[PDB]
Structure formats: C-alpha cells, structure tokens
Design an enzyme around this catalytic site. Structure first.
Site, PDB file in Angstrom:
ATOM      1  N   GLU A  53       0.772  -1.245   0.000  1.00  9.61           N
ATOM      2  CA  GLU A  53       0.000   0.000   0.000  1.00  9.61           C
ATOM      3  C   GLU A  53       0.801   1.291   0.000  1.00  9.61           C
ATOM      4  OE1 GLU A  53      -1.138  -2.964   0.477  1.00  9.61           O
ATOM      5  OE2 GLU A  53      -2.369  -2.173  -1.175  1.00  9.61           O
ATOM      6  N   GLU A 103      -6.492  -7.535   3.206  1.00  9.20           N
ATOM      7  CA  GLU A 103      -6.805  -6.866   4.478  1.00  9.20           C
ATOM      8  C   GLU A 103      -8.296  -6.579   4.608  1.00  9.20           C
ATOM      9  OE1 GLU A 103      -4.530  -3.457   5.797  1.00  9.20           O
ATOM     10  OE2 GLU A 103      -2.729  -4.330   4.878  1.00  9.20           O
TER      11      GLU A 103
END
Lengths: 496, 498, 496
Positions: A172, A291
């Site tokens: 990310e 996630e």
C-alpha cells in the site's frame, strides 16, 4: 416478516478457494511479541510459541497467512531477521514507531506456520528497497541450494526451501503515511520489473500487485488500472483493503456496510477486465482481499502511544475489543466474500493475533481467548468449502440513515458435493424484526441450525468468559427449508 | 550629499534569527585538510584542530555551520567518515577531482563545532543515494540508543546524540556539473519521500529542499515551485545560492549587485507564496540562504588544477584573496539579508575556512589571518541580533553601467531590547562623493561609529598583516533624538546608540 | 551476366577503424566455462586458458572484445568475480537460467585478452545496479591507486590498471526478456547520469549508449532519439544489434537480408543526425554495432534446456553449427559494415567462442575447430584495414520472395596506402548464374584471388574437418581487373 430464496446446484457462481479463509500477521503491537511468541512462558513450546494460541488458530482452519506486513514491510530488511539471533540488530520501525528486535524472522515464522497448518504469503519491501533485494529473498526462500542465498538459508538451519507460493509486491504505497510512498506510475514500474525478475528465478510462484489502500483514496481506482497496465503479464492478483467502523453508533447503518463492500469489489473487478481488454489478454486477474476487518475501537489509545510513548518494544497497538454487532458485520463480510468467490481467491482477516484480531492474549503473558468475531469466521472456514450458488432471493428491505433499500436478510448457499451437504450462511441485519426464511431447495434432510445471537449488541468477550459463542439452537419438510432468523443474528443452517 | 532615513522602534520588520549568521565547511580544497584540521602542527589541540583558527571562528559568532557540502555530498558515503580511522577508506571525490582521506568525519567535525560554539546543519547524499541512507544517518545522529545505527554511534566514541536540528535534502542537483543530477520532478519526489521518512524517525528536525543553484539557471524558479509542490508538507525551507564577481572591473556596478540580490529573494518569496495559495496552506516556507559570498578571484588557477594535477589531497582550490571593495559588497549583502529577516531565517557565508573564506591559513602549516570580508560579517553577527526595524530611507540615487537608480546609502537598523542598544548598519556605495546620514530616531545616547574605509579599492590583506580592519573612528555625534553621521565615500559603517 | 564497378582512390568513404573487427564474449553457455577457460586440460596453459582457442582468436585479428554481456550483465554483480576465488559466490543467472560459478571474472578475462592481442570493451549493470556501482567498477579498473577500489584491484593481484577504453551503459534494456527492463526515458536518464559520473573519474574513456535490441522493436528508432536526446553530451556511440536466420529455407531471400541491415544502419545514422541538429552540437555520434551474426539453428534445443532442466553450470546454449550460405551472409554483412565505416567505428561479431561462434570446442575438454563463418571474418579483418572507396557499381538485379531489386553482386574496395595494396571483397548473392566483374581501376599488378565456395549451400564444418576453407583459386591487365565470381561465393581479390 417473510423472506424467500430458491437454492439450486445448477445455478453456480464458482468453487471456493480455501485461501479466502486466510489471515495476516504483521510485526505490529503484540501480534508476535507478547502474542504468538513468548519465549519463557509456561504455555510456550521449545521455539517460544504459545501452544494455546496455536490451538486456537487451528480452530479457524487458516490455510494462508500474509507476512510480515503491512506498513512494516515497506522499510524492513529481511536479513535483519535471519541467521544467528545474537547477530540480529534492533531496528526502528518507522511505520508503528516501535523497536523491532528481530527475534522472529522468516525462519521462525515459517516454523510457526507449519504448527498451525498454514503457509506464508510473503510481502517484500518495495518502499525503500527494490528488484535485487526481492530476488535475494525469493532465492533464499525458494531455491534449493548451491547458490549464494539458498546456501545462506541452509547454513541458517533450514535445509529444505520454504517454497513460498504467493508473494506480495510491496505494501500500500499510495498513502502519505507509508515509508517509501509511490505514485501509481512509480509503483507500476517497480512492480512490473520486480515481478519479471522474480518469475525468472521461480516460474511457479504467484504475485499480488498492490491495489489502493482503500476505495476512499482519491487515486482509487486509477491506481489499480495503471498498475495492472504495467504489470498485467507478470502478476496474478490485485489487492483490496477494507475496514469498517461504528464510531457513529448507528447499528442499522453499520450493518449495511457489506453492501458497500459488494460495490467496492465489483468496481475492482470492472477495473481488471478493462485492462484485460486493453491488453487483449486471455488471462483473468483475480482479487486478493489481503486486508479486511472491523476496525475502530482502539483509534484513540493508538494515538496516545505515538508520540508520548514512541520506540517501545511491542506496545499494545490496535487492540480492538469486539462486540456482538461487530461479529455480525464480519459475518456479513464473509457472506459477501463468498458471493464473489469467482474472482476473489485469497482473503486475509486483518489480523490474526492481538492486533485487530479474533484471538487475544492478555499482556505480559496472559491467558488467551476468543473475541466475538472469532466465531462467524470459524463457521465460514469450516462449513464454507465447496461450491457457491447464486443467491436468487427476494427479501424484505429497509432504509438506514445513509443507505437506501438495504436487504433485511443477506444469505449465500455453498454446496459440498464430496460431503453431500449444503450450508446456508444467513444474517438478519434487521435489528428489530425477526424474519422467517423460506428456502426452496431444488434438491435433494436437515443437520443443524447454528446461531450467533445476543440481546446486547454492544456485548463483548474477555479473558473471563465468552458471552458470544455458537449455540446449537432452533428452529424443512418436503424440499422447502423454513427457518426463523432472529433479529440481529448470524445463522448457519446445514442439510444432509 | 544629504541622506535621510528614519528609525522607529514601533515600526518593525522581524526578529533576527541568529541563523542568518551561519557559515559552511565543505570537504573542498584546504578547508579541512591544511585548514581547520592540522594534526601535527604546533597550534593544533589534542584532536588536531588549529586553535588560532578556532579562536577566529568564535570571533565571528557563527551559530550554525553547513556540512559536508556542497557538491561533495552528492557522492559522499557518510559511513566512510566514522568508526576507527585506520579502517576508513580513501575515496575519489568527483566533485573536485581530489582524494578524500576521510580522516575527518561527522563525529570529528561535531567536536570541532562544539569548540567554536556552533551546530552542524547536515546535508545528506541524494545524488547517488536515497531514502534509507538518509534514514541511517539521521538515526546515527539523533536517536539516543537501543537500535543499530545509534548503538553504532555509541560504539564509535559518542555516547550522546548530536541531535542535529536542520537537514539539507541533497545538494544543488539542477546543475549538469553535479554528480547524480536530477530533474525538478525526480528531485521533488526524492525530497518529498526522504523528508517523509526522516520526520518519522525524528519529528523535531527541520528540513531544507534545494532551490536552483542560481537565479540564472534556466529552470529557475519553476524548479522551486515544482519541488515545493511535491514536498510542501514535509520541508521547512527552500534554498537560495548567489555569488558575485567583479571581473568587469566596474566598482560602482559591482556594489550595486545587492539590488539583484533583493530581486532574487523577492522572486523566491513570490514563488513560495504561490505554492502556498495552491496548497491552501497556513504554513509559510522559510528561506535558507545556505550559500552566499563574493567569488571570482581564483577561477583561472582553480581550473588549472583540474585536470592537470588531479587526485591530490587538499589542493589549493577556490582560494580567493579578498579586496576592500569585496568587503563592501559582502557588507551590502548582509544588509539585504537582514532587511528580509521576516522570511530568511538561515543564511550561510560560503565558505568558512580557506575556500572563498573570511579566514585563511597559508599552506603546509599556515599562520592564520583575516581577509577583508571577515570584518563586515563580524560586525553583522555581533551587533545584529534583536529586531530589524523598517527602513524608511530617502537616499540620493545614482545610475551605473548595468543598474539604474541605485541608492547611494544602503542602511538598516537592528534593535536589541536586552541591551537597549540600536545598531545602524550603512554602506555608502557612492564611491566618489562622501555623504552624511541624518538618522531621525524615535527612541530614545551615542556609543561609537565603527568604520571600514580605505583609499585603495583593490587593496588586500595577507598573512603579513591586515590593511583593512575596523577603526573605532568618526565623526559620529548624537544630540536629543537626531543622529547625524558622515558616511565616507565607499565605506562600511556600524553606528551604535545607548 | 555483366557486372561493372569503378574504383577511385580520390573517391573515399572513410578510414577503417580496426574496432569493426571486434567481437564479444558473454558468460553464456560454454563460451567461457568449457570454452576459452578449461583449468587442467592438456591443451591449456597454467592459468587454465585453452591455448588452441587462443591461437584461433589471433587468426581473426580481433582488437576489441565486448564483455561480460549481453543479457547476463543486467543482473551481474562485478565484485562476485574478483578477489580470492574461494570467496566468490555462486549466483543465479536469470538471463540464461544457469548457475554462474564466477571462477572467471574481470581479472582472469583481462589477462586472456592480453594473450589474444585484444582490449576489453566493458559493460556495466544498469539493470539492478546504478551510478555508484558503475563508478566503483571504473575506479577498480582504471584508477592507478590510492583509493578504495584502485587499491582493491592491487590487493587482488593486478598492479597496473586495465585502463579500459570503451564502456557500454548497460545492455539491451528495452526488451521484456531483460532483468531491469527500462523505458526509453528511464534509460535515457540513467545512461546520462552514469556517463556524467564516469567521465569525472576518467575523462579519457568512451561511452556507448544502448540502442534498440533490434530494428523490429516497436520503440525503434524513437528509443535512439530519446536516449541520445538525454545523453548526447556525455556519450560517444549508439549501439546496434542485428541477427538473421533462415528458417524459411529461402537461401535467396536470406542472402538479401544484408539489405535490411544497410537500411537499419542508415536509419540509426539519420536518427543521430536528427538529434545532432536538435542539440546544435558539432559532434557526431558513432555507431557501435556490438552484436551481429547469423543465429537460428539451435533455437528449439535452447528452449528445452530452460526450463525443465535449468540451473546447470555451462549448459550448451546457442550452439549453432553454421552452413555455407550462413558464411555468405556474414560476408555480406561485413561488406555492408565496411560500406559504413565512416559512422560505424566498432562492431562485434556475436559471439567469439562456442556461443553462436566461429570458434567451437567439442564438450568436456573437446577439441577445437573452425566454423564456416570463421573465414569471411578472417579475410575481412586481415585484408580490410585501410581506406574504404565508394562502391560505384552497376550490378544485375534479381527479386526474391520478399526483397525486390536485390543486387547480384555486393562489393567494396579498401585501399591500404601503406602496403600499396587494394583489396576487393565481393559476394555473388545470385546463387544460380556466375557473374563477371569488370573493375575499372583509376590506379595504378594482380596478387591473388582468394575464394570461399562450395557445391552444397547447406554443408557444415565439424570437429572432423573443414568442408569450407579458403582456396587460392581462379581466374587483370591494363588497369582493368576482370574476375569470375562463381554463383553463391565469397571472393577476396587483391592488387599490388
């Protein structure tokens, strides 16, 4: 009052990849230290692994665990965590303002993963590191011997290569909070080149490219498009992250959020197929939801910990205590993952131990226990192997404060041919009315009805007792299953 | 003949940030080797530092010192300057075609700074290195202990952290001479990311993003605009670099070049103000002028040595020998700096020792003497703390060959409340005609009128004694509220009040 | 049947630079291990070098050899091949799916080059490595002493610097097969900055910027225009690669592919001249044709080795056995190179030993012999030093399957003023009719006419003897030279 859905093995969506019941451990808070790894503890084996925690993990049947991050990975140097522990350094972890002692690295975690019947999904550092370091790590883990890094593994005590199947190209890097934050072109290029290199060393591995940190990022979903545009031919998945919160205390609208999860997923699928067309490729990119969870409870104590207490080892970060309503949303999310099992082949409950987790240990060596969210997950993973059927369903609706036309009942059927069972996962997110679900099963005997219910939405579990736990309660005649779904309940109805 | 200006304690510009009296040592020429550091010499303490040199630096009251570059830093590897000296490698310095023995590094230079009552402003290598290297160096310097690079510092002789307060994100990388030259976009991005990471390690530091190498670069000021658009939220300063020379032999034009300095500064402020609006930010970027001086005398000889005698250790590079007219421009530049004290919070005379410096040691053991430019910098630094007051000045004007309407008198007042003094710095760039300055001060006794004059503009100093030095002179005179000072043609003036 | 060509010393093209008779050795296949380098073999010296190989190289008069790649260099770490041999790692070579033991590296190859009367042209990793690492290597090789890397070379056993004259800025990074693949902008920037830095360590070097991998790359010639637009003021050459094959089995079309080479060269020249005008520079860029050959025979076999049999040391890759037609095209290519000796100042036959080579050793201690292509190169290299004279020539034309208006005769004259000779090189691409060459010489005695001919176009050489060798055959007067050029043949006609 009444909800109707028909269930037919002919009308498939896809086969469930058990890797959608994965999870994730990051070097964050007490996930590892004062968590899975507690060296001198009475409940710890030879490797320092909490035996009671291992058992609890096997209960969830987690086949794959992402590691070691998470933001942590963006500035990690994997050599710091291997070899003679005496010669491993202590590093500043910039992500979580902690000190990383590196007493658990690739090899230690690798053996922890055998003990819970999982395998690693490895993240590599693409924030401050790049192509050659990714290659070293891959060689270390997957090449058998007689090259520099495979001999380094062997020397470090691990004769057989770990042979890690799936690798994640960084983490990310879209966010301003990330060390080594990249633009979409920058990350696209580095991911394409890393993927190209890694595949030359081991053609059998699979690769996940990073999607946006959340759908709420201004660069969503162009990030995904651009990144796939560069790296399509060398990668196998795009990543998705979603977290939900009830800080506004609006249980009806909270429970409606899996509808946004559905929308999020579809957007990412559409973005994939756009690029697929662009490349005139025959290959489908699949989704890695590496996630997902509920996450809000502990935001403020996390704020106090940095600064005011920076550079501690293993501070109690991200320790959400989950409620009953939270466990409902988790159930709703699993349901949503299932309905998209044709494209989602990997998912990770974030995270596994202590840090936004379904498994807590107390602190300074405490006793270990299941949070509320542990259960809808256990059911999903256990009775959820098989074939997903299209939920053809007419159900009552309702509005909430910020969501229109939200179904009262949210359900999916998954059929296991090798066991001759059909499990119906069902949730009544009508917080007030009970509802009867009539299920025309164009079958093909009833096996049980497992329920997660409670009168207090805000009730919790703890080291002292469980409160929320599966109760084999309730309540099928011809080929018509009729079942009362309590207001605000998670239901798991089986057939034989 | 008549110069009128009007001081007023209530009419303020800004409080002087003492960091406008900073300087700068690069690993260049004789700055360190056969300069501030001479390990055998009889004037050198137990570490190897010339104590005469140490005493001279202290005279200048230099609170902050840039290090170690300058062009040098773009290919420097800091780890080479620390740990056991026997195990430090010698390196090619591409910047200056010289061999760097690394016998002085970081820990050694931080000791030197303690002894001159200065702090290090540290530059990091962003030419051939990046984020993680900047991270290690910061941890090594600023993190107390208990981690790899801090414990490492400790193992190297330094128990407490240097806790360096200001960092430079690389050096002047727009130029085709710089090793690891970057485009405005490459630098903007590396600067943003380096700054983001560093501030996670130590939130107390401040950071400087590089501006253009000069206002004459074709990519100025879009460089600045672009780099700030990237890094705005993580950096605190933008840099400016400016040097002047008098190769044209036109003195009246040469002293007028501080007007160009004013314009340069305003342009950078306008550029910052524009990005500020663009970002809708409440924060102002401040200005670090981390390279300024007169520079021109040694250009011929500097090229001679590169490359006809390359890879020497400590060659005599950039050893400009300063004249008196040079000292007046330096004086004017300091005035212009002071005038913009509301946005310029750091400034560095480039450089401190031997290399275009106010301080000189001879060669092969030296002697140590003050150049002409030593003196205005000394005065400025000594009497220039406190509050810059707004200059309302009606000065006679004069054209020159390349400038128009240049003030004859250039003046600024600085008021120290803690001493109830008010210093008045003035330069008479009217090279021909003496002029008196009528200072109507809404105060508020007279204390002195230090002066800097000589009849030969091309006169120099040397190891064989000064020539240009302050004379406690004048011809000052203060009555009730009015100060009236005769400012000799081509002079620097320091006029005080009690 | 009739072909004429005028030859005027006043009508020059350029002085030939001997470096167009360069070649190339990559850490590929058996080029080095079980090629030039064979430790304790009866045919090898103390150092391990095969003496008979050494002699064969000298017969080609090669003044310059490119090393060590080639795709290999793009993930090569030079420090691995120097110092105590016991402390050199074995590394995965991702380019050729092989294990590189690194017994030969830089210092060993620098002294082999002595024994063959040749200088190294050194390539630097710009795939996984960058500026600082190219500086170190240059320092190691070229700086006399007194710095970290110069002293390191002295410690390793070499007191005088190799003083390498030409360096290549990476290799072929425009192709998707290369580790560290770069965009033309990424590469333009990196070559530029690497050049700038290297010229600060040693101003006397020349630098080659990477051109396109081949003229068929979609980004040709824009890659050239772009890269040069960045690095013009710091580089001296642009590289060219070209390789031809006869899978169509169309010997006539195949023999016409020297016309696509001629066109390739011209486009690269136009591109250089374009940027030159754009820069307003007074400098010309020269062409470094640092990869050219025939290459196609061993394609299928190569695939079989990587993968399903990878990570071998010195596997038999790229081992083409060249035919006679193959030899004709080399000669054609040589002549084409020669015609452009005013802009082409370096060319490398790829490769020297075993790997698509004119010199072969058998396998496991082998034997050593000459391929067909050995000879045209040998003649060109020996009788080709001098001054190129414009090909004023009227030749019969023929069309082929894919090339219109191909010349029947391709030919050049070069005039070595020192030896008072004039060599003519000529090929009869007309494989059927025998053509006569009326060569008007505005001279200025006939010395000899060497020929390379054979009845079977597909005949090979082998360790058992040469089916193809120069025969002193044939078949002058006033100042008018007339010679018969047998159909499908290589001719070297000489004058004193």
């Amino acid at each position: 009052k009444k909800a109707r859905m028909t269930v037919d093995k002919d009308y498939k969506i896809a086969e469930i990849d058990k890797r959608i019941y994965g999870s994730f451990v990051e070097h964050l808070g007490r996930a590892v230290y004062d968590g899975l790894y507690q060296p001198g503890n009475s409940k710890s084996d030879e490797d320092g692994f909490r035996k009671d925690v291992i058992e609890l993990v096997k209960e969830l049947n987690v086949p794959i665990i992402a590691y070691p991050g998470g933001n942590f990975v963006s500035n990690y140097f994997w050599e710091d965590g291997v070899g003679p522990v005496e010669d491993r350094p202590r590093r500043l972890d910039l992500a979580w303002k902690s000190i990383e002692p590196n007493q658990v690295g690739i090899n230690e975690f690798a053996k922890w993963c055998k003990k819970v019947n999982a395998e690693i999904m490895m993240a590599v550092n693409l924030g401050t590191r790049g192509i050659s370091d990714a290659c070293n790590l891959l060689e270390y883990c997957n090449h058998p011997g007689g090259s520099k890094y495979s001999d380094m593994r062997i020397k470090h005590g691990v004769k057989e290569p770990h042979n890690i199947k799936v690798w994640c190209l960084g983490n990310e890097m879209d966010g301003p909070w990330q060390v080594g934050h990249k633009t979409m072109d920058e990350y696209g290029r580095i991911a394409e080149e890393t993927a190209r290199a890694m595949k030359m060393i081991d053609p059998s591995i699979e690769l996940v490219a990073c999607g946006s940190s959340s759908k709420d990022m201004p660069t969503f979903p162009q990030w995904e498009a651009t990144v796939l545009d560069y790296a399509y031919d060398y990668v196998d998945y795009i990543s998705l992250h979603q977290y939900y919160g009830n800080k506004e205390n609006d249980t009806a609208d909270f429970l409606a959020k899996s509808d946004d999860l559905d929308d999020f997923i579809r957007s990412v699928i559409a973005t994939c197929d756009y690029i697929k067309a662009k490349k005139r490729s025959k290959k489908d990119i699949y989704l890695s939801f590496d996630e997902w969870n509920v996450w809000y409870h502990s935001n403020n104590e996390d704020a106090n910990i940095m600064q005011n207490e920076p550079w501690r080892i293993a501070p109690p970060l991200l320790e959400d205590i989950y409620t009953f309503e939270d466990a409902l949303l988790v159930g709703l999310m699993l349901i949503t993952l299932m309905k998209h099992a044709d494209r989602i082949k990997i998912a990770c409950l974030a995270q596994l131990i202590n840090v936004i987790a379904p498994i807590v240990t107390e602190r300074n060596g405490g006793a270990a226990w299941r949070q509320t969210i542990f259960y809808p997950f256990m059911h999903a993973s256990k009775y959820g192997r098989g074939i997903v059927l299209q939920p053809v369903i007419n159900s009552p609706l309702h509005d909430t404060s910020k969501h229109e036309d939200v179904t009262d009942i949210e359900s999916v059927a998954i059929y296991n041919e090798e066991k001759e069972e059909v499990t119906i996962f069902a949730v009544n997110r009508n917080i007030h009315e009970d509802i009867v679900l009539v299920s025309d099963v164009r079958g093909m005997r009833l096996l049980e009805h497992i329920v997660l219910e409670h009168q207090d939405l805000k009730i919790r579990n703890s080291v002292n007792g469980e409160e929320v736990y599966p109760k084999n309660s309730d309540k099928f005649d011809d080929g018509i299953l009729t079942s009362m779904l309590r207001r605000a309940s998670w239901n798991v109805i089986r057939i034989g």
